[PDB]
Symmetry: D2
Subunit: 146 residues, 4 copies
């Protein structure tokens, strides 16, 4: 019943970030009725962690990729490319106001948006935790069939 | 028929790097008998992409990754280029052959097994993934390394 | 007069990081009696800077680094923030006290001695640089590390 | 006439075998064609590979000493973001009142402001108006006499 979101991020790498940033994002996602697979939580060797994370990406319904930073985290980027090729739902989160881009259309490297529509890709692009609950944005719509 | 290799790199972004670093790498790959898809040339991303061409560039690079036989991924830098990494993840998800290239001697990893983020090797064997990891341009020709063996 | 620490970080660029990550660090520094200059709030860089403002922001942060007594440099990230590093270099050249913060467990270096690019430690002593290298917000108040000894001694 | 000013050539290019070999020498040549004494730190201070623990402090102080003693920095600020070691060096250069020249032939933007293509602090030691003259976007452009490096050499 619950849609499953793989929450890809670099926030597990920093003690303070793991503790303070991830839980509010998880709460906002769960308040939408989503089942959240957060990889740092679900983990707790290197090869087993990689295949574990690979299996989760294969089996999610959508990825919600935290793409903060200059540049976005390379592991998130790989997990995002996996998700595009496997036709998962794609949602992007960036509340970083810096622009690190190769083009005028997008605020980031244009490949991050190759799995998103030409028009209305911004409906999938979240710029604040406050925005996740929005019924006018693609996450809510995708959960309600629209 | 030549096996198709998509050469993913961030080298088309710098004029000097485009001109000096990519052609030698393209050559060593064509010397194995490979057909090389180099996306900055192939799909003409030569400058800061205009708003009305960014989508076409993106969909063109994506289609080459679907249609190649393997990715040769230049993973220099701290960290590896994000577009390269999207393209590499596509490759892994689509079961393409995977070849990694890094002649950068800096060590940036989240784990002590691999010299980079463990997720970059997810598409490579647990044992002998080093055979797929090239550390120098002259190493591409090596007859004991996975690219030559991949052409059998 | 309180000792002045310039809190250099990339955390002001992210809405959530600004709101949740900086205040706890600010408080850990103030608990030692430090006057904390946090440049995003001080010099009002709260979004993508308008062109007519970018130079004034740069001179204000540059002045603040000149007028501080030491820098507390958040050097999380791969690689560390470039603005933080310009500011750190200024701090080194100006013989400010230097303290580095990184609670990111990834190691990202060009040498086997230091966990980061060795230039970041060029203003730190040859032996005992780890006393200037904090790896947790909790560790900041260590009555045994270089920041506490700097305030007191 | 033109003076034999010392440029410290800060770059990430010595980290990559192929970049050390093909990318730096043409930049060194372009600078030397202007009559400059080039201090390229990878070659000058022997940073060849992943430095040994017992060698890393000397590399650091040697790069640092060279930035203290140069007349100007030529900073290759390619990449997203620019290299952190180059940036520390550019920080020291700004604070020591050294001459500042920026090289970026990377067409991507990684910036926090609309005025500059990079973090606005990279330009803090550059003038408010006319900073473009200190900003080089091609190896060919380095020897132009209408740009700030040429003029810095002639003008006292
Ligand atoms: C595919 O690889 C390069 C590196 O970002 C870009 O052309 C691409 F187009 F995205
Ligand atoms: C100096 O302090 C913060 C760190 O990015 C920015 O304003 C700065 F402006 F770079
Ligand atoms: C000093 O270290 C930095 C790393 O970027 C290089 O520029 C150096 F010269 F070694
Ligand atoms: C999958 O890769 C990235 C590393 O950033 C994390 O999201 C993971 F779980 F390890």
């Amino acid at each position: 019943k619950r849609k499953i979101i793989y929450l890809a991020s670099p926030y597990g790498f920093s003690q303070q970030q793991k503790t303070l940033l991830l839980p509010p994002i998880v709460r906002a996602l769960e308040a939408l009725g989503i089942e959240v697979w957060e990889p740092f939580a679900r983990n707790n060797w290197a090869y087993r962690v990689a295949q574990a994370d690979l299996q989760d990406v294969k089996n999610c319904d959508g990825i919600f990729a935290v793409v903060n930073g200059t540049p976005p985290d390379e592991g998130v980027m790989v997990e995002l490319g996996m998700a595009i090729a496997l036709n998962k739902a794609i949602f992007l989160f960036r509340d970083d106001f810096r622009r690190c881009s190769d083009n005028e259309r997008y605020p980031l490297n244009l490949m991050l948006f190759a799995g998103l529509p030409e028009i209305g890709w911004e409906n999938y692009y979240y710029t604040s935790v406050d925005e996740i609950q929005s019924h006018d944005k693609a996450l809510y719509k995708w959960l309600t069939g629209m």
